Amino acid sequence: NLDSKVGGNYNYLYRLFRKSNLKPFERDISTEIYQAGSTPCNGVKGFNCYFPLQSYGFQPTYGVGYQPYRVVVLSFELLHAPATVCGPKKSTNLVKN
Amino acid sequence: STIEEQAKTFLDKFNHEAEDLFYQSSLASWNYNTNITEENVQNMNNAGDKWSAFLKEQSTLAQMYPLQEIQNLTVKLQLQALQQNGSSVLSEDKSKRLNTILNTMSTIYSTGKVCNPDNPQECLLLEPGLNEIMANSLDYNERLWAWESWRSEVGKQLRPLYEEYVVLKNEMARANHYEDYGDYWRGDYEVNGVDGYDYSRGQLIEDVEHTFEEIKPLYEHLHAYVRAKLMNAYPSYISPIGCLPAHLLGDMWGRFWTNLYSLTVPFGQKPNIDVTDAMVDQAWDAQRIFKEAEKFFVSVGLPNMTQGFWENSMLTDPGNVQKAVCHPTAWDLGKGDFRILMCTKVTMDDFLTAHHEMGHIQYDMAYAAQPFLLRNGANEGFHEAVGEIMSLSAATPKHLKSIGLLSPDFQEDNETEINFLLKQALTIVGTLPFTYMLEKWRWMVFKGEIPKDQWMKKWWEMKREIVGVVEPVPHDETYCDPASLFHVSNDYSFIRYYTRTLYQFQFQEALCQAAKHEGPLHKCDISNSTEAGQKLFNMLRLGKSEPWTLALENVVGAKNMNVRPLLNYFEPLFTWLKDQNKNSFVGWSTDWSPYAD
């Protein structure tokens, strides 16, 4: 109901091809052309040279299973630094005497 | 470094790009079919040419990956369709003239008409105009005027266009290393790469010929039954040992005999099963017709329909302002987008049609997890066969009494069931010899065994031998019967109709044995039985990614086509026809002619 629009949204891309698998918590923004075989590419599309980034088709008419989902991943890591973020507290009534 | 790594990389990227353009190409055709506008006619040609030229550009990189170095079966099948260059193998002159002949023959078929001999001013087109009149017309001259005069301005006019159609399509098969163009359609059943399951292309010629031999004793008893009913009308033209006229088959080309079910009713003193008058009192609309059919797929274990399917369905035609084609069709766009364009009225046929139209959508959900290249039926006959077995279980009196259409006190006996099996036989039994006749004729002409002058000489000569039909007026080589046919002129597969009958009855027998149904096969109902849906779901998700001979064994246990389910399902009718034909002559002769005495 938000991202998908009539005509398609090409702003969101993804990396289809990479020479190996990424390490945990690694971000690679490199646009370098992926080389499948031994044929030199040098940034020019051609035989065994493919542009890695591909587009997500976004329209409201697509099926429910393939509808894009916005995913928010919270990374919880406990380091040796002093703890700060904590859960919410609760305040009760005050009584005297 | 290996070719398999380079071929798989090409296929991983191609599945994404081909899936994006095919969705926009199918969406442009959807907006054009549902709404006729000047914007949609241009979008269909624009999106259609972008997808058509996309396969041509990717075919250049597909031929650079030989299949000899690839040991994977799934990779070679995805590259099997991309290896073919299509029309690119033809010369530039023959490639441009090929699309012209296809568009010209399709335009003449749509714009063709036969003017009334009695009313020269009124001129009615074939579809719907002439196809509707030929259904209910009982007259001898009125049917002959529309049947004979059509091929005069069509069959004779499309002859030079059909001659060019044969020459152009033969040069494409020769560049593809095919024996002829008749072998091109037989390549859909081709299976290679698996030990013992290999299926040769030339084997189909012997398969359709051998299975048709056991069809003869069942067809001869039905052909003599129909002839005995129409014998009293014209005893001079209709001989007991002769053949039936071509124009009296119930329509133009004699594809289905259902139009003759009215006069062939064995017992007219008993009611017939009809859900039309039952749905009127229940007050049902087009919204609940698909809803009740969706519960049929849930009872067998198959998943339900997505919310976008029922919301985007087109339930009617809003007048002439926005016009939509009422011909039922199941359109599969992609990425889970499923839509059906049909004009839904309240009739007994639309109830069985809803199970057929939703059968294609339910069939596409199983293999939808496969890549775009692997999304397809295992052959051309499995597409429509899956939707028919869904309608056969709905037409049974057991399923009708379940939801409340048919009264539970309705008497079901031999007299009621024989009347029902005869209606299906006219559509089924009458189709096989006619489909085997015209398809075998195309294979012989495309091969070159029949000279151009003998086209019509062998057409009617082999027609009396197969379907037992003789022409009232003899025709010369100028006329061409297949040229006016919808499937031949539009370059669609005509073989899918013959094999469909054998595939749907095999699946009908296997699913009823898995659910432990007893009695005759036409009494079987697959509803409420979840055991049969599980065995079928395994094959439905395979598609063409696996050999059709291997997927067929996982259901019926057979590696090829078999006539045994064809005879068993028609066995109650075959025993009744044999007793009624004792007073007549079983079979026909090819030496009888209406103009030769």
UniProtKB/Swiss-Prot annotation, chain A:
Result of changing V44A: Increased resistance to neutralizing antibodies
Region: Immunodominant HLA epitope recognized by the CD8+, residue numbers: 9-17
Cystine connections: C41-C49
Name of the protein in question: Spike protein S1
Subunit and partners: Binds to host ACE2. RBD also interacts with the N-linked glycan on 'Asn-90' of ACE2. Cleavage of S generates a polybasic C-terminal sequence on S1 that binds to host Neuropilin-1 (NRP1) and Neuropilin-2 (NRP2) receptors. Interacts with host integrin alpha-5/beta-1 (ITGA5:ITGB1) and with ACE2 in complex with integrin alpha-5/beta-1 (ITGA5:ITGB1). May interact via cytoplasmic c-terminus with M protein. May interact (via N-terminus) with host bilirubin and biliverdin, thereby preventing antibody binding to the SARS-CoV-2 spike NTD via an allosteric mechanism.
Effect of mutating S38N: In strain: 20A.EU2, Iota/B.1.526, Omicron/BA.1, Omicron/BA.2, Omicron/BA.2.12.1, Omicron/BA.2.75, Omicron/BA.4, Omicron/BA.5, Omicron/BQ.1.1, Omicron/XBB.1.5, Omicron/EG.5.1
Lineage: Viruses, Riboviria, Orthornavirae, Pisuviricota, Pisoniviricetes
Outcome recorded upon mutating N1K: In strain: Omicron/BA.1, Omicron/BA.2, Omicron/BA.2.12.1, Omicron/BA.2.75, Omicron/BA.4, Omicron/BA.5, Omicron/BQ.1.1, Omicron/XBB.1.5, Omicron/EG.5.1
Protein function: Attaches the virion to the cell membrane by interacting with host receptor, initiating the infection. The major receptor is host ACE2. When S2/S2' has been cleaved, binding to the receptor triggers direct fusion at the cell membrane. When S2/S2' has not been cleaved, binding to the receptor results in internalization of the virus by endocytosis using host TFRC and GRM2 and leading to fusion of the virion membrane with the host endosomal membrane. Alternatively, may use NRP1/NRP2 and integrin as entry receptors.
Record note on what altering Y14F does: Decreased HLA binding to NF9 epitope. Increased binding affinity to human ACE2
Region Disordered: start-end pairs: 16-51, 80-97
Phenotypic consequence of L13R: In strain: Delta/B.1.617.2, Epsilon/B.1.427/B.1.429, Kappa/B.1.617.1, Lambda/C.37, 19B/501Y, Omicron/BA.4, Omicron/BA.5, Omicron/BQ.1.1; Contributes to cellular immunity evasion and increases infectivity
Region described as Receptor-binding motif: spans on this chain: 1-69
UniProtKB/Swiss-Prot annotation, chain B:
Known outcome of mutating E92P: No effect on interaction with SARS-CoV spike glycoprotein
GO molecular function, one term: endopeptidase activity
Impact upon substituting R174D: No effect on interaction with SARS-CoV spike glycoprotein
Topological domains annotated Extracellular: 1-597
Effect recorded for L21R: Increases slightly the interaction with RBD domain of SARS-CoV-2 spike protein
Disulfide bridge partners, by residue number: C115-C123, C326-C343, C512-C524
Effect of N312Y: Increases slightly the interaction with RBD domain of SARS-CoV-2 spike protein. In sACE2.v2.2; increases interaction with RBD domain of SARS-CoV-2 spike protein
pH dependence per the entry: Optimum pH is 6.5 in the presence of 1 M NaCl. Active from pH 6 to 9.
EC number: 3.4.17.23, 3.4.17.-
Subunit and partners: Homodimer. Interacts with the catalytically active form of TMPRSS2. Interacts with SLC6A19; this interaction is essential for expression and function of SLC6A19 in intestine. Interacts with ITGA5:ITGB1. Interacts (via PDZ-binding motif) with NHERF1 (via PDZ domains); the interaction may enhance ACE2 membrane residence. (Microbial infection) Interacts with SARS coronavirus/SARS-CoV spike protein.
Name of protein: Angiotensin-converting enzyme 2
